[PDB]
Design an enzyme around this catalytic site. Structure first.
Site, short mmCIF file in Angstrom:
data_model
loop_
_atom_site.label_atom_id
_atom_site.label_comp_id
_atom_site.label_asym_id
_atom_site.label_seq_id
_atom_site.Cartn_x
_atom_site.Cartn_y
_atom_site.Cartn_z
N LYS A 1 7.82 38.99 61.08
CA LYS A 1 6.89 40.05 61.41
C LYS A 1 7.62 41.30 61.85
CE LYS A 1 6.20 38.33 66.12
NZ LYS A 1 5.16 37.77 67.03
N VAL A 2 6.95 42.44 61.73
CA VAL A 2 7.48 43.70 62.23
C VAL A 2 6.58 44.23 63.34
CG1 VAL A 2 7.95 46.09 61.70
CG2 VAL A 2 8.61 44.31 60.07
N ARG B 1 1.71 50.78 48.39
CA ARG B 1 1.59 49.96 49.59
C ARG B 1 2.95 49.84 50.29
NH1 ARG B 1 1.22 46.49 45.19
NH2 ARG B 1 3.10 45.22 44.90
N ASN B 2 4.03 50.07 49.54
CA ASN B 2 5.37 49.88 50.07
C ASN B 2 6.11 51.17 50.34
OD1 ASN B 2 5.60 47.09 50.42
ND2 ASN B 2 6.01 46.75 48.23
N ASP C 1 10.04 45.84 44.44
CA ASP C 1 8.62 45.88 44.82
C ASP C 1 8.14 47.31 45.06
OD1 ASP C 1 6.10 44.91 45.34
OD2 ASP C 1 6.61 43.98 47.27
N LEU D 1 2.82 45.40 63.76
CA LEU D 1 2.48 46.31 62.67
C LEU D 1 2.09 45.53 61.42
CD1 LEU D 1 5.41 48.84 63.18
CD2 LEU D 1 3.00 49.14 63.84
N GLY D 2 2.80 44.44 61.17
CA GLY D 2 2.51 43.62 60.01
C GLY D 2 3.31 42.34 60.07
N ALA D 3 2.98 41.38 59.22
CA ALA D 3 3.63 40.08 59.27
C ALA D 3 3.40 39.28 57.99
CB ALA D 3 3.12 39.29 60.47
N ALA E 1 4.87 35.34 55.97
CA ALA E 1 4.95 33.92 56.25
C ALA E 1 6.07 33.57 57.23
CB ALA E 1 5.14 33.13 54.95
N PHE E 2 7.20 34.27 57.13
CA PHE E 2 8.41 33.88 57.83
C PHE E 2 8.79 34.84 58.95
CE2 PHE E 2 8.76 33.28 53.18
CZ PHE E 2 8.55 31.92 53.12
N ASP F 1 12.93 47.74 52.65
CA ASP F 1 12.64 46.36 52.26
C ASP F 1 11.63 45.77 53.23
OD1 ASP F 1 12.53 43.75 51.49
OD2 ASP F 1 14.70 43.51 51.28
C1 LIG Z 1 -2.93 47.87 59.94
C2 LIG Z 1 -2.45 49.28 60.25
C3 LIG Z 1 -0.92 49.42 59.98
N1 LIG Z 1 -0.49 50.81 60.29
C4 LIG Z 1 0.90 51.05 60.29
C5 LIG Z 1 1.86 50.28 59.55
C6 LIG Z 1 3.26 50.58 59.61
C7 LIG Z 1 3.76 51.65 60.41
N2 LIG Z 1 5.11 52.00 60.54
C8 LIG Z 1 6.32 51.41 60.20
N3 LIG Z 1 7.51 51.94 60.56
C9 LIG Z 1 8.64 51.27 60.19
C10 LIG Z 1 8.62 50.07 59.47
C11 LIG Z 1 9.85 49.34 59.08
O1 LIG Z 1 10.95 49.80 59.39
C12 LIG Z 1 9.70 48.06 58.30
C13 LIG Z 1 10.82 47.20 57.82
N4 LIG Z 1 12.08 47.64 58.11
O2 LIG Z 1 10.64 46.16 57.19
C14 LIG Z 1 8.43 47.67 58.02
N5 LIG Z 1 7.24 48.34 58.37
C15 LIG Z 1 5.97 47.80 57.97
C16 LIG Z 1 5.04 47.23 58.91
C17 LIG Z 1 3.78 46.71 58.48
C18 LIG Z 1 3.45 46.76 57.12
C19 LIG Z 1 4.34 47.32 56.17
C20 LIG Z 1 5.59 47.84 56.58
C21 LIG Z 1 3.77 47.26 54.79
C22 LIG Z 1 2.64 46.22 54.97
C23 LIG Z 1 2.19 46.29 56.44
C24 LIG Z 1 7.34 49.58 59.13
N6 LIG Z 1 6.22 50.26 59.50
C25 LIG Z 1 2.82 52.41 61.14
C26 LIG Z 1 1.43 52.12 61.09
C27 LIG Z 1 -1.23 51.81 59.47
C28 LIG Z 1 -2.75 51.66 59.74
C29 LIG Z 1 -3.55 52.66 58.91
N7 LIG Z 1 -3.23 50.27 59.44
#
Ligand SMILES: C[C@@H]1CN(c2ccc(Nc3ncc4c(=O)c(C(N)=O)cn(-c5ccc6c(c5)CCC6)c4n3)cc2)C[C@H](C)N1
Length: 310
Positions: free
Chosen positions: A49-50, A171-172, A167, A42-44, A46-47, A185
């Site tokens: 990823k999720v 975006r968050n 933060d 879903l995202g990542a 430097a240290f 977080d």
């Molecule tokens: C690139 C793609 C990413 N797409 C997307 C991103 C996140 C989620 N869903 C989700 N569900 C739970 C958590 C957590 O629990 C968690 C944690 N605990 O740190 C962190 N993220 C997370 C993951 C990636 C990113 C962020 C947060 C902000 C920056 C990019 C979560 N994301 C679903 C779809 C939306 C699409 C339009 N474009």
């Protein structure tokens, strides 16, 4: 710093008896790693990823559901493992709330540390706003109000736990079923290095356009500085996701402006009352800023007025 932190508060409404970082992990969250099937990243940052995953037999209802799983990268050392466990420890201590991305479990044995949280199917609020902004259902004031209130409740919850966020930004904020907004977080899922909204300050990268002046100038971080950032988030929501201080580059001139009391102009879709929240959030004197509970209360009134007229 951009991660959540528990602080001490005296003669406040809430008291910090323990620092969750200490008194380590409660093995009650432990979940069988093998019962996780990994999906897309879903995202990542430097240290770490999720990644998205399916979890089988999770919880009291032991349902099969989509979850998010946080983990370290290869570049991660001991310092990185500790910070992840420290993030795990905080989420386990905070307890649950409807507008926070809640801890569902963890895998701390038999392999790398995994942290399992609720999956938010619609992604981040900023992208959602910008997509809605250029469609032809279209967003209405009541939707924008709901996002505002849901985040405000999440933040009022954090404040009640003497937890600062550091933060706050669109975006968050994530949107889950029913497009309910949740905060969390998210640092480790944030590719901070490759997001130009995080400005290099020597050794750090800071969301300068979102930060209270005292945070920028004194490195002070309080619930009140989170309130300032929440005001910037409001401006994002009711502009349908413009970049703050549009056109204005982050340079010495930017700092003088905010220092000197500059404030963004009312966004296209903010009623005057909502803009007044923004202004109150951007009071230079931190103690003249509203509390999150006062913001919740006032937003609640705006929502009933909308429900009455509309
Ligand atoms: C690139 C793609 C990413 N797409 C997307 C991103 C996140 C989620 N869903 C989700 N569900 C739970 C958590 C957590 O629990 C968690 C944690 N605990 O740190 C962190 N993220 C997370 C993951 C990636 C990113 C962020 C947060 C902000 C920056 C990019 C979560 N994301 C679903 C779809 C939306 C699409 C339009 N474009």
């Amino acid at each position: 710093q951009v991660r959540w932190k528990i602080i001490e508060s005296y003669e406040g409404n809430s008291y910090t008896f323990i620092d969750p970082t200490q008194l380590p992990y409660n093995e009650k969250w432990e979940f069988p790693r093998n019962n996780l099937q990994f999906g897309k990243t879903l995202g990542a940052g430097a240290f770490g990823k999720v990644v998205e995953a399916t979890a089988f037999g999770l919880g009291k209802e032991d349902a099969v559901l989509k979850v998010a799983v946080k983990m370290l990268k290869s570049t991660a050392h001991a310092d990185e493992k500790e910070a992840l466990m420290s993030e795990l420890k905080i989420m386990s201590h905070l307890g649950q709330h409807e507008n926070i991305v809640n801890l569902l479990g963890a895998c701390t044995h038999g392999g790398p540390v995994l942290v399992i949280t609720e999956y938010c199917c619609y992604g981040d609020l900023l992208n959602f706003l910008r997509r809605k902004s250029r469609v032809l259902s279209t967003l209405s004031t009541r939707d924008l109000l709901h996002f505002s209130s849901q985040v405000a409740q999440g933040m009022a919850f954090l404040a009640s736990k003497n937890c600062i966020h550091r933060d706050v930004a669109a975006r968050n904020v994530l949107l889950t079923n029913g497009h309910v907004a949740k905060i969390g977080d998210f640092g480790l899922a944030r590719d901070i290095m490759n997001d130009s909204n995080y400005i290099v300050k020597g050794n750090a990268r800071l969301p300068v356009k979102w930060m209270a002046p005292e945070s920028i100038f004194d490195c002070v971080y309080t619930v009140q500085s989170d309130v300032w950032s929440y005001g910037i988030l409001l401006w994002e929501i009711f502009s349908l996701g413009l970049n703050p201080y549009p056109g204005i580059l982050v340079n010495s001139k930017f700092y003088k402006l905010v220092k000197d009391g500059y404030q963004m102009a009312q966004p296209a879709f903010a009623p005057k009352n909502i803009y007044s929240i923004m202004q109150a959030c951007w009071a230079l004197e931190p103690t003249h800023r509203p509390t999150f509970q006062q913001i919740c209360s006032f937003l609640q009134e705006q929502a009933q007025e909308d429900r009455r007229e509309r």
